[PDB]
Design a protein around this ligand. Structure first.
Ligand SMILES: O=C(O)CN1CCN(CC(=O)O)CCN(CC(=O)O)[C@@H](Cc2ccc(NC(=O)CSCCO)cc2)CN(CC(=O)O)CC1
Ligand SMILES: [Cl-]
Ligand SMILES: [Y+3]
Lengths: 219, 211
């Protein structure tokens, strides 16, 4: 029932600002406090601030002048706004709910917003269909793939047949091939499904405005 | 600003009782610090375990208990389960701000061994039009998360062109990883045998290609 929905991936240039919206459901902001926390690629958790049920706020001392958290109770939205971002502000930012006693625990968290602070060039991914080199045996399982090569920055979303396929799907962690990322995804389906029916890889990279569909064809 | 210290990592076996600690640099951890504990599971998914009054959220196992032991906050897990493999963060309240500890990674041993399922993919015809060829070797369903990948062309080993990921968890608690070998379209057309060898716990599993 309880959800904290965060706004999409954000690429920020040094000295500029960051804005994140946490849209909540299953509870009211009039009863609960919402905290903001971050986790760097090379660290653990760092608490940034909070907006309590009553509208009151608290922040980590070093952030007073650069960070603000406010809300709109009627829209069930909490807004995070931070200025003067630096390279070390690159992290996954989360909003987390916390109630008053006996509900005084950080129970439900948002999925996180990936923030990259960089003066580097945003590169779109080159999506390539991966079909097996050999034809499948009569009445068997086939493993088809999708290569997402050379992108910056993280993340990328990969689905198969618009989300219809999931059980035989594996989406692998990204690797760093010289300032650029590369990942792959596979789907294992019965030989009676493919090439008979259409199997498509759908790839999204928010930061470069790319959304491509690559149909897996034989050879 | 206070620093909150936790053990970096603890390794345990199923059924063991373990105690994670949370220390304050400004002095003793007191009841007024309302110590909270949070659990982080793979794919950056966090969930609350213990509240400020040592209270557990509905659905959190009773084996998780928060307390103060002398001058430090503590999380006692009474009978570690395999599903408790995670990073545990403590958070302390200091009158007008919360401070999270650095986290304690908990590893739980004795989980069943699972051999890797390997798949080798040839480059796309679209790839070859950019005069580049990437061979993808996917590795799934293995436990423990330690694997070595060796690539061979006609039989001769190659160190150049290869890039492999660190093992990470799947939705079923086993590990996955992937390896890439980027060659030119010219090199792909020139040779006849390419191989991906995945070694796990002494045993090697291999998948090959023939143009
Ligand atoms: O919450 C956190 O981050 C950390 N808390 C740690 C302590 N708490 C235990 C815990 O949290 O573990 C016990 C007290 N807390 C109730 C609860 O948690 O049961 C609230 C008591 C309270 C005091 C004053 C007001 N004043 C006003 O409304 C206007 S005052 C205008 C002055 O000119 C409202 C509520 C206050 N905590 C905000 C909130 O809980 O909403 C902030 C502190
Ligand atoms: Cl208080
Ligand atoms: Y409170």
């Amino acid at each position: 029932q309880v959800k904290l929905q965060e706004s999409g991936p954000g690429l920020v240039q040094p000295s500029q600002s960051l804005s994140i919206t946490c849209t909540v459901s299953g509870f009211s902001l009039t009863d609960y406090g919402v905290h903001w926390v971050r986790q760097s690629p090379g660290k653990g958790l760092e608490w940034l601030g909070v907006i309590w049920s009553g509208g009151g706020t608290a922040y980590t001392a070093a952030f007073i002048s650069r960070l603000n958290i406010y809300k709109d109770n009627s829209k069930n939205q909490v807004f995070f706004e931070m200025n003067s971002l630096q390279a070390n502000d690159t992290a996954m930012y989360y909003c987390a709910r916390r109630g008053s006693y006996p509900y005084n625990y950080f129970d439900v968290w948002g999925q996180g917003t990936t923030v990259t602070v960089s003066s580097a060039k945003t590169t779109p991914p080159s999506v390539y269909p991966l079909a097996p080199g050999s034809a499948a045996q009569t009445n068997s399982m086939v493993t088809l793939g999708c290569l997402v090569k050379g992108y910056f920055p993280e993340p990328v979303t990969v689905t198969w047949n618009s989300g219809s396929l999931s059980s035989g799907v594996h989406t692998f962690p990204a690797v760093l091939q010289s300032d650029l990322y590369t990942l792959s995804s596979s789907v294992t389906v019965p030989s009676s499904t493919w090439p008979s029916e259409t199997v498509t890889c759908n790839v999204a990279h928010p930061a470069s405005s790319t959304k491509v569909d690559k149909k897996i064809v034989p050879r | 600003q206070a620093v909150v210290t936790q053990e970096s990592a603890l390794t345990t076996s199923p059924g063991e009782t373990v105690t994670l600690t949370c220390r304050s640099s400004t002095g003793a951890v007191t009841t007024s610090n309302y110590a909270n504990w949070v659990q982080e599971k793979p794919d950056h998914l966090f969930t609350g375990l213990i509240g400020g009054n040592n209270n557990r959220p509905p659905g959190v196992p009773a084996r998780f208990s928060g307390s103060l032991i002398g001058d430090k906050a503590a999380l006692t897990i009474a009978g570690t389960q395999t599903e408790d493999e995670a990073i545990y963060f403590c958070a302390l309240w200091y009158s007008n701000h919360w401070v999270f500890g650095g986290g304690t990674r908990l590893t739980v041993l004795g989980q069943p061994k699972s051999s890797p399922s390997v798949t080798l993919f040839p480059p796309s015809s679209e790839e070859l039009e950019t005069n580049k060829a990437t061979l993808v070797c996917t590795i799934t369903d293995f436990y423990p998360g330690v694997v070595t990948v060796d690539w061979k062309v006609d039989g001769t080993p190659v160190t150049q062109g290869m890039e492999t990921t660190q093992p990470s968890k799947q939705s079923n608690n086993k590990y996955m990883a992937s390896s890439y070998l980027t060659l030119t379209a010219r090199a792909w057309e020139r040779h006849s045998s390419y191989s991906c060898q995945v070694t796990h716990e002494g045993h090697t599993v291999e998948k090959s290609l023939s143009p």
